[PDB]
């Protein structure tokens, strides 16, 4: 029993973090096989960031412009290229700790584990959702750039995020491991800001199912709803519209609890309209949206507490 | 910026988890040097748990009664002893991945990282406070026994918890790595229950300081309080009394923010009396108590956003 914001074990990623220095600038890189990946802003001075031309800043660098430090060990850079907003450094040594891995672009509303790192040394691990507005509510200080996000499935690490930026509201922006930004953001100084955000409806429903699996039904009701009637309420409360695809995804949690998805929607409508009346669900006074249906099945018992 | 329930990176602990089997019963052990530590209830059948005599159950076992599996590899057991509620198995092989480590008994209100494990395989990591009633609000299923808690400081792992039990309220109980239970709990079937709990006052104050370091002052006021006047309010709201020792511990956070500890107490009193009036602090609608003053200094900027 219990329900916690649980991260994946971080060992397989720890063995891949290095430090990358170009001139005065140090940040984190990810060392897989004989490649190191890091944010391309490592090549900029503070003043370069106002209006950088990366193509023109990079052609002025050699391989030996880059220092890569793996723990105590200097890795020799023997090649470099830019891929979107990442630099790829080829080094003289294959990482003996390279895990089984893939690069994936996660979708909005999906979750991942962040390994915050400074100076190539891992400092902490926590779980993040990709918000609908393509930001994450992370915890990052200066020096954290090149920290990665990931998911693990049967000893394969799916890398999905590299940290580039803190926006003016204190939320975080970065790239997939092909160096494409999540959201409309750019690695230069602009008036860019987090767009308006929404509550991840599918995740709230998964988390209500979690509460029932763990033995709590106080918030259920004798009502049902159409998808249309639910969505009129969702819009009022700045919830993402529910789609048939989202109903289909909730099929296994619905089956394990015997609560029809639209019967759970009727419960959520009533909670949005009436509040929680001083009660909690899984310890929370608020409706939680940072757990996916996959996260609930991973962490909850396969046997409902009936 | 940001503020997250952050766990330590779990790699150094992952390399120590093994599986321990005695008959039908499998659970997790911790492999350091040539010793494996696990809950002594591994030697019990389900029916043994009603009234076990561990001394009498253990003398009936040989070394070869115990199977220890480190990944793919069988470790041969060559010795065994009981230490309080732990078994210590000596094995034929020293763990090549043994980190620098110590065994520590944490105090109530202190935090640690839990590596949930099943069948010797790590599944997840999250941060826990030791509640005043000596329980943790974990997330554990059947098979999780022998999962450990820890803190890391400069590459030294301080192990402080081993998981033994889920209480009837769904909260968790275990031992230090000398096998002494936290709290009044026992590794046998009784009417035992979590005692009443309290809010960890020192941690709430640390977390208000965190909010100011990250740039928020909405909840401050022009009032001060005596320790006595604060504690009359604390008792009304089921908060731990504040002591002079707790005021002294908050000295560095008070210095970094320029807010006197008793001026912060006056702010907390006002929040307890009046509520938050629909506002948040660091994203929360409630007063958070699972971050220590050490956790705040670890995660927050050393420069206040003034
Ligand atoms: O946001 C950042 C870097 N960053 N990421 N996470 C942070 C958490 C706290 C503080 C700073 C943090 N920026 C701002 C910028 C400006 C144009 S795009 C993004 C940033 C600031 C300075 C540099 C820099 C490059 N060379 N020297 C300094 C890079 C990124
Ligand atoms: O609580 C447990 C074991 N445990 N720990 N975390 C749990 C999370 C979910 C389910 C069970 C969990 N107990 C109960 C008991 C009974 C007397 S003291 C503690 C437990 C239940 C069964 C065994 C057992 C021993 N041999 N075979 C079964 C051990 C502990």
UniProtKB/Swiss-Prot annotation, chains A, B:
Signal peptide: none annotated. It catalyses: TSAVLQ-|-SGFRK-NH2 and SGVTFQ-|-GKFKK the two peptides corresponding to the two self-cleavage sites of the SARS 3C-like proteinase are the two most reactive peptide substrates. The enzyme exhibits a strong preference for substrates containing Gln at P1 position and Leu at P2 position. Residues 1-306 form the Peptidase C30 domain. Residues 1-306 are cytoplasmic. The active site is at residues 41, 145. It is found in: Host cytoplasm; Host Golgi apparatus. Exists as monomer and homodimer. Only the homodimer shows catalytic activity. This is 3C-like proteinase nsp5.
């Amino acid at each position: 029993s219990g329900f916690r914001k649980m991260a994946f074990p971080s060992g397989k990623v720890e063995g891949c973090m290095v430090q990358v220095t170009c001139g005065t600038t140090t940040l984190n890189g990810l060392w897989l096989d004989d490649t190191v990946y890091c944010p391309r802003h490592v090549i900029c001075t503070a003043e370069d960031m106002l209006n950088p031309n990366y193509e023109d800043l990079l052609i002025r660098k050699s391989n030996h412009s880059f220092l890569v430090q793996a723990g105590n060990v200097q890795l020799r850079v023997i090649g470099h290229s830019m891929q979107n907003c990442l630099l790829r450094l080829k080094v003289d040594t294959s990482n003996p700790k390279t895990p089984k891995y893939k690069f994936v672009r996660i979708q909005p509303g999906q979750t991942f584990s962040v390994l915050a790192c400074y100076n190539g040394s891992p400092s902490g691990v926590y779980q993040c959702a990709m918000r609908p507005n393509h930001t994450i509510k992370g915890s990052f200080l200066n020096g954290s750039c090149g920290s990665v996000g990931f998911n693990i499935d049967y000893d394969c690490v799916s890398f999905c995020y590299m940290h580039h930026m803190e926006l003016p509201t204190g939320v975080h922006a970065g790239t997939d491991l092909e160096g494409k930004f999540y959201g409309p953001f750019v690695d230069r100084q602009t008036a860019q800001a987090a767009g308006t955000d929404t509550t991840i409806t599918l995740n709230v429903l998964a988390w209500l199912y979690a509460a029932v699996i763990n033995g709590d039904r106080w918030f259920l009701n004798r009502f049902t709803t159409t998808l249309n009637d639910f969505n009129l309420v969702a819009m009022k409360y700045n919830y993402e519209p529910l789609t048939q695809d989202h109903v289909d995804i909730l099929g296994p949690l619905s089956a394990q609890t015997g609560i029809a998805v639209l019967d759970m929607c009727a419960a959520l409508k009533e909670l949005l309209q009436n509040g929680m009346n001083g009660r909690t669900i899984l310890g929370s006074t608020i409706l939680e949206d940072e757990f996916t249906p996959f996260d609930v099945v991973r962490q909850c018992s396969g046997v409902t507490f009936q």
